[PDB]
């Protein structure tokens, strides 16, 4: 089991082509096929209301992490309110748009290919402990200090365990999102 | 002392903001929340001439590992030709641009914070043996087989020893880069 830590102060802001905001890539699988990535973690800055790009064949789970929330319109809609730290799953082929009813928003974005990855996502707080055989475990901090696997994650830092091949026993303290990804087949 | 072996097939690639190329992450230290990584290994794919990101307070050592070579301009100063496997050191704060003259180039990139890490870098071939108290030892292979510490590194695989706390006795065979990093505590 290899531990890597992604520090948010090292993230690179990539403005969107449409000027509606920007993306900070955190990490992703190798995923270099014409098929593309198997999974990707990023933080999206959403600066103005607008539509979301499509990602046919991918599952998305997004979570507001900065800002008071925003409203989403998914396909044929009831409008969905996204509050801070409330994750929201939707298919990547859905037509989705957001309205920034309180100002600009930052989302924590998980996207993965159901064909290629098993996936688990859970926001947690306090002291947590889990056992997992998942190949990749990610811990994304939204606190000043999330302690996990001997590391201290600051704000939007992300710890990544890779190449797990046994049962990991992981304790976490603090407000963070736990993601577990395992290659299928 | 824990050994990880990063396999080049799993190197996560990220494209550059300006589109000039891409960076494959090899490994980086855990860093801190405030100051980000203290060091990083990566392979940069340079597909177009152009400028290099600046990294104030960081020291860089880059080495052409694929392609016939390229020309650097460091600040406004004289051109530097980088030939395959000739390491070149420069400050992260210097404005640096490269001119491709033979096509795209791949660089092995070391970066570290001199305030936070002692560092050593040496390209070697053949049989090597060294003793080092360094806390982290990385061996980056540019050969089909580099034997070190009972592992076998293939093309651009990278061995990493962490948390060494005595005098390591390390033997290496084959064409590779030896990097040693120690926190300045
Ligand atoms: Cl999007
Ligand atoms: Cl995404
Ligand atoms: Cl660069
Ligand atoms: Cl670098
Ligand atoms: Na830094």
TrEMBL record, chains A, B:
- InterPro entries in the cross-refs: RmlC-like_jellyroll (IPR014710), RmlC_Cupin_sf (IPR011051), Uncharacterised_HutD/Ves (IPR010282)
PANTHER family found in the cross-reference section = PROTEIN VES (PTHR37943)
Output this protein's name. Protein Ves
